[PDB]
Design a protein. Structure first.
Lengths: 132, 132
């Protein structure tokens, strides 16, 4: 069982300097918004999967853009009732390759997404911009 | 329904520059680790709750340290089978005040934590270091 550890310490009002393996970032009221960070966590996790999968399937990736939008419940806790994720692959990428990468990631490989899926409505979409 | 939005773009191999409301951070294989970021997201979210609650209940906070440890499943998706969160309040803080803040946060206010709770075993603990 791989162990992941982070440590937070108050830096400013309701804000925390957060120590991770690569460095420290400020998260909180006056720093990176916590719920936006959750989306970044989801996007990067899945993004890592899509990148490796597209590469394994011989696609030529010039760039990968991932857009995430979350709609929060109005009452506490204000979790995301819905999360929209749109994947845009740029380069010589076949739509079928991107679809496989997205589905394997969202349904099997991305750990962050697997942890929140049961608590929200996930809407996934994707598109390719063929470029040389 | 408040809407939160972030946008990611490939920056280096399997890494993404992630645009949020305060700025951009690198998340991925060569940047902030995605699963460590989830822990930072959880810690800061809850941390924001604890800070405000302790303040409302007239406690004199000199500092707040939050330690999070996650134990991941060995098979995909490698979600956290367990997440340990330890809250340390420093200053003129009564243990009862910290307990109330932690429980209200973990059971009602923190949105990030509410989204992953159903998928893992959460172990919460706390302590105060009385300081003047």
């Amino acid at each position: 069982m791989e162990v992941k550890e982070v440590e937070l310490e108050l830096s400013s009002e309701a804000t925390f300097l957060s120590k991770t393996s690569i460095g420290e970032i400020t998260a909180g009221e006056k720093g990176l918004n916590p719920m936006e960070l959750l989306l970044v966590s989801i996007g990067s996790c899945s993004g890592v999967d899509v990148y490796h999968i597209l590469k394994k399937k011989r696609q030529e990736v010039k760039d990968i853009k991932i857009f995430l939008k979350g709609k929060r419940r109005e009452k506490h806790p204000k979790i995301y009732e819905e999360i929209e994720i749109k994947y845009v692959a740029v380069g010589k990428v076949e739509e079928k390759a991107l679809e496989q990468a997205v589905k394997l990631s969202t349904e099997k490989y991305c750990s962050v997404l697997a942890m929140v899926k049961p608590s929200t409505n996930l809407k996934i979409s994707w598109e390719v911009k063929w470029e040389e």
